[PDB]
Amino acid sequence: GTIVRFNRPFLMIIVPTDTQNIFFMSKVTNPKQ
Amino acid sequence: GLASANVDFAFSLYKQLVLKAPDKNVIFSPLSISTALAFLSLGAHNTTLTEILKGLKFNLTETSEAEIHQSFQHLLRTLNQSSDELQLSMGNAMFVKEQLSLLDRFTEDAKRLYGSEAFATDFQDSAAAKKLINDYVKNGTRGKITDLIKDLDSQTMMVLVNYIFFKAKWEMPFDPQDTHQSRFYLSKKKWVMVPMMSLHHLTIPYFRDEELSCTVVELKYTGNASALFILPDQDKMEEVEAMLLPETLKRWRDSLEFREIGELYLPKFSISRDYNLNDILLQLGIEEAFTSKADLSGITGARNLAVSQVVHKAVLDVFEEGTEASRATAVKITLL
């Protein structure tokens, strides 16, 4: 079984489900700020 | 149309923000920034105007200023839907100095195209003006953005404001009881302890990008919105960032296929960022608007206004039940 673990820097992009567009975008390098 | 420009703009802006602070979290809304600038371009003329539209990544040969503002109008009409478990709202406002004369055309275009409210502000009482704008934003972002405006020149003539509030629930929520303190690697040898949420045996859109050394997964929200997560391999972030292009996003989304995931771990966190976008905008070609040659005569009929500063405040909350994201952009405009 595959495991996806977000325990290192990642990108999060909030997009509409049926449209190629970007509402919000973030790079989380440190979740503790 | 507008979507294509927005994605291009989003990635261009992103790369500039990273260059400014390569070690910090990046949090922003292309939409909030684009909207505020397009709103401002309503009163711009000649080169000032051209630069803004070109800076917003619009192909002025394939689209006209008229089409652009229409796209923003429809966009605003569409977005404002805070009901079906998903709350999404966006508002525009202009705080203008008491007794400053604005062209009727500008005010009308602002109301019908940007749904902008207009508030007469006494910019001479800086402390009062600040609170008014900040309270408007606080109200609009349900309490998330509290201090968008930290200071104002006593020479401020007006401030354009845009805010976006988003609150959605995961289609597949995380059980708080499965959240445990675990390591988040800042670097290969350094880490912090954070609440790591988890989900077991879930089928979601997935794509392992072997070419770019990253994994892409999509976690849908209840409504017409999803969160795309891109996990670069250890030390591959910069490589992925160098490839953040509209064609890359499209390729990723088109390559997504449903796959059974044994386990998924995602940190629970609340982060915020404060930005002075002057440097970034200048780097994107928006220059004249900030100089003595600023041509914003479409606002009052005379070239007596220039942008002094564009700020952006962002907040992101990711937790078991869903996500809350708030953004706000302000364009401070002074006398020229």
One-letter amino acid identity for B197? M
B274 three-class SS:
strand
Count up the domains in chain B and report the number: 2
Domain hosting residue A23, numbered range: 1-33
Residue B47 CB neighbour total at 10 angstroms: 14
Q: How far apart are the first and last CA of chain A?
A: 32
- Tell me: do B155 and B125 sit in the same domain: yes
- Contact criterion met (CB below 8 Å) for B151 and B129: no
Distance CA B171, CA B169 (A): 6
Q: Do both B35 and B103 map to the same domain?
A: yes
Q: How far is CA A33 from CA B186, B194, B312, B316, in A?
A: 11, 11, 17, 11
- Our count of domains for chain A comes to 1
B137 Cβ contact list (under 8 Å, min separation 6):
B145, B146, B148, B149, B161, B163, B328
B324 φ, ψ (degrees, to nearest 5): -130, 125
Contacts 24+ apart (CB under 8 A), B56-64: B56/B5, B56/B9, B57/B5, B57/B6, B57/B8, B57/B9, B57/B12, B58/B5, B59/B5, B63/B1
Residues B316 and B332 placed together within one structural domain of the fold: no
What is the C-alpha to C-alpha distance for residues B283 and B15, in angstroms, rounded to an integer? 11
Contact, B175 vs B152, CB < 8 A?
no
Q: Is residue B145 located within the same domain as residue B162?
A: yes
Note whether B240 and B255 are same-domain residues.
Answer: yes
Facing B265 at nearest CB: one of A5, A11, A29: A5
What resolution in angstrom units was achieved for this structure?
2.1
Do B223 and B102 sit in the same domain of this protein?
no
Decide: helix, strand or coil at residue B293. coil
What is the rounded distance in angstroms from the CA atom of residue B44 to the CA atom of residue B98? Answer: 21
Q: How far apart are CA B29 and CA B6, in angstroms?
A: 10
Q: Are residues B88 and B197 in the same domain?
A: no
Query: Do B5 and B90 belong together in one domain?
Result: yes
Question: What part of B 276-315 touches A (C-beta under 8 Å)?
Answer: 314
Say which CATH number the domain at B64 has.
3.30.497.10
Helical spans, DSSP H, in chain B:
2-20, 30-41, 46-55, 65-79, 104-114, 126-140, 237-242, 246-255, 278-283, 297-300
Cβ B200 vs Cβ B263: under 8 Å: yes
Q: Does B258 touch chain A (CB under 8 A)?
A: no
Same domain, B101 and B147: yes
Interface-testing mutation among A15, A23, A33, with chain B (most B C-beta atoms within 10 A): A23
For this PDB entry, the determination method is X-ray
* Closest-CA residue to B227 (of B168, B314, B142): B168
What's the CA gap between B27 and B139, in Å, rounded? Answer: 21
Does A23 contact B269 at a Cβ distance shorter than 8 Å? no
Check which CATH number belongs to the domain holding B243 and give it. Answer: 2.30.39.10
Both tokens of residue B34? 């684009």
- In eight-state DSSP terms, residue B290 is G
Shared-domain flag, residues B253 and B280: no
Q: How many CB pairs under 8 A join A and B?
A: 163
Cα gap B43→B60, rounded to integer Å:
17
Strand A24-28 and strand B305-318: pairing? unpaired
> Residue B184: which domain range?
170-266+326-336
End-to-end Cα separation, chain B, in angstroms? 35
